[PDB]
Amino acid sequence: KMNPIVELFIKDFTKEVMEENAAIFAGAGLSMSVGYVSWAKLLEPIAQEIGLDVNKENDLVSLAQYYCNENQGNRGRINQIILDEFSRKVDLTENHKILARLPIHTYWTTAYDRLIEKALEEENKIADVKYTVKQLATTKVKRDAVVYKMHGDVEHPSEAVLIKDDYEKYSIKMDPYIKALSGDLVSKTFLFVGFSFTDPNLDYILSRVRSAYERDQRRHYCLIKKEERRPDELEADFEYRVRKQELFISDLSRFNIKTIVLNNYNEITEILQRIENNIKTKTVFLSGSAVEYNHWETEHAEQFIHQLSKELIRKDFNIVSGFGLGVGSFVINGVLEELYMGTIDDDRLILRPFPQGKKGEEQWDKYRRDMITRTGVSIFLYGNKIDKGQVVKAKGVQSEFNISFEQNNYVVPVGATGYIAKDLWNKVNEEFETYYPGADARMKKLFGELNNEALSIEELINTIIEFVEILSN
């Protein structure tokens, strides 16, 4: 768990992303942990040529402009520097991979590198990268996300926004990008990551949006790390910097941009992981097959499964089922009862009955893996089939459990149902920290209660629902 402000932000932004109305605004700071050297370090020889010192300079745009002025406006050196630096092959950080995995269809970047594009490519996602006005007129077919590189691309250094001339002519040359960013800011919920909010173009666009929409501006989010006490600095200077940062945050609020203050930069990764988990765990994989329903009678167990599926649908969960013999019909009935109040939404219930025959069993493993990949939580019930007239614990449920563990999915074996479910519950309780690291007391109590045969249908269903909810929320 994190700070209550962080928890509220995680809930709200997960809600925004699940509606596919969220955009990510990534600054250069998101790529500073990857391995690219700092822009000030690159400009250090540039500053030394014109007789300045990059460490004593804070406005690097004016520094680059001064260098260009000292060379009759020529940018060849800076173009070569940025091409040499930001085109290097660097391993992607975890933040880029998580952002690629999230269902985010809009990225706006002020960085010249192609880390977002590579992260989207490695997720088998089609990325429509735009850094030219002409490129706005063409859309890639079946694209997953669109990346607006509003400061240019690394492979086109001459069109990168680096000097004051570029910022001054941006409002004329790149006006369609300004219009697009204004439309996204008024129509989408943005998350600013790695952005210092010192960009003149972004200040201009935000001021225009504020002038247009007054107090009815859309709420956006930013992630900013708190000020850290430098070794040379004194306590008074640190407190002054903290107060300055606080005033900087209220000003951003003037643009209806709420700032989340983070202790360190790894909290960005933690927040992204939490959002990804909240999105992924909303889909539950219901598994099991039952000819004999352990201690419970047939009708009682059927009603239990029906009401469990109805509660899962009611709690805004998407059920994926393999249509196991003896369990599939009743989860289908529960979903139908919950939804027919109507049509079967494709997202709420995904049914994947296994092909029957010799041909089906060849691809059964890939079918099972594809079915499980859609989910983030696996729920196992019973696990008994009939082979030679006798009830024998099933083997498909064990394969499902193995696939779920290999995909880092949460496993919720209900031991009260018995058979392979009870075996899996015993296995999980044998090594609880391996499957649920850092579990709370309530989580342990719910997991232990999952193997209670004295619970009624309602009590067991409520225990399962609460366990799945604390896993997801």
Ligand X SMILES: O=P1(O)OC[C@H]2O[C@@H](O[C@H]3[C@@H](O)[C@H](n4cnc5c4ncn4ccnc54)O[C@@H]3COP(=O)(O)O1)[C@H](O)[C@@H]2O
Task: From 208-216, 254-262, 297-305, 396-404, give the range in contact with ligand X by CB under 6 A.
Answer: 396-404
Write the single-letter amino acid at 8: L
Torsion angle (degrees, nearest 10) of CA 118, 119, 125, 130: -60
Residue 61 · residue 164 · CB < 8 Å: yes
How many CB atoms are closer than 10 A to CB 427?
Answer: 15
Query: Taking every pair of C-alpha atoms in the chain, what is the biggest distance, in angstroms?
Result: 91
Angle between helix 266-280 and helix 4-18 axes, rounded to 10 deg: 50
**Strand pairing category for 106-109 and 22-26:** parallel
29 is in an annotated binding site: no
User: Smallest gap, in angstroms, from Cβ of residue 374 to a copy of itself?
Assistant: 9
User: Smallest gap, in angstroms, from Cβ of residue 49 to ligand X?
Assistant: 43
Contact with a copy of itself (CB under 8 A) among 37, 58, 300, 360? 360
Q: Which residue in the block uniquely carries the two structure tokens 């960009």?
A: 199
Instruction: Check residue 150 for interaction with ligand ENA (CB under 6 A).
Output: no
User: Smallest gap, in angstroms, from Cβ of residue 302 to ligand X?
Assistant: 15
325 is in an annotated binding site: yes
Of the listed 96, 105, 151, 306, which one is catalytic? 151
Q: Which does 138 bind (CB under 5 to 8 A by kind): ligand ENA, ligand X, a copy of itself, none?
A: a copy of itself
Nearer to ligand ENA, 181 or 468 (CB): 181
d(CA 155, CA 90): 16
Q: Which residue in the block uniquely carries the two structure tokens 């995680």?
A: 10
User: Smallest gap, in angstroms, from Cβ of residue 4 to a copy of itself?
Assistant: 7
Contacts with a copy of itself, 297-316, as mask; x by CB under 8 A: -----x---x----------
- The yes-or-no answer on residue 220 being catalytic is no
165 is in an annotated binding site: no
Which one, of 450, 457, 149, 197, lies nearest residue 311 by Cα?
457
DSSP 320-367: EE---TTTHHHHHHHHHHHH------TTTEEE-PPP-SHHHHHHHHHH
Instruction: Check residue 397 for interaction with ligand X (CB under 6 A).
Output: yes
Task: From 30-38, 71-79, 232-240, 329-337, give the range in contact with ligand ENA by CB under 6 A.
Answer: 30-38
Footprint of ligand X on 323-352 (CB under 6 A): 324-325
Query: What residues are labeled active site?
Result: 151
Known binding residues for NAD(+): 22, 113, 151
Contact residues: ligand X, CB under 6 A: 287-289, 322, 324-325, 354, 385, 394-397, 400
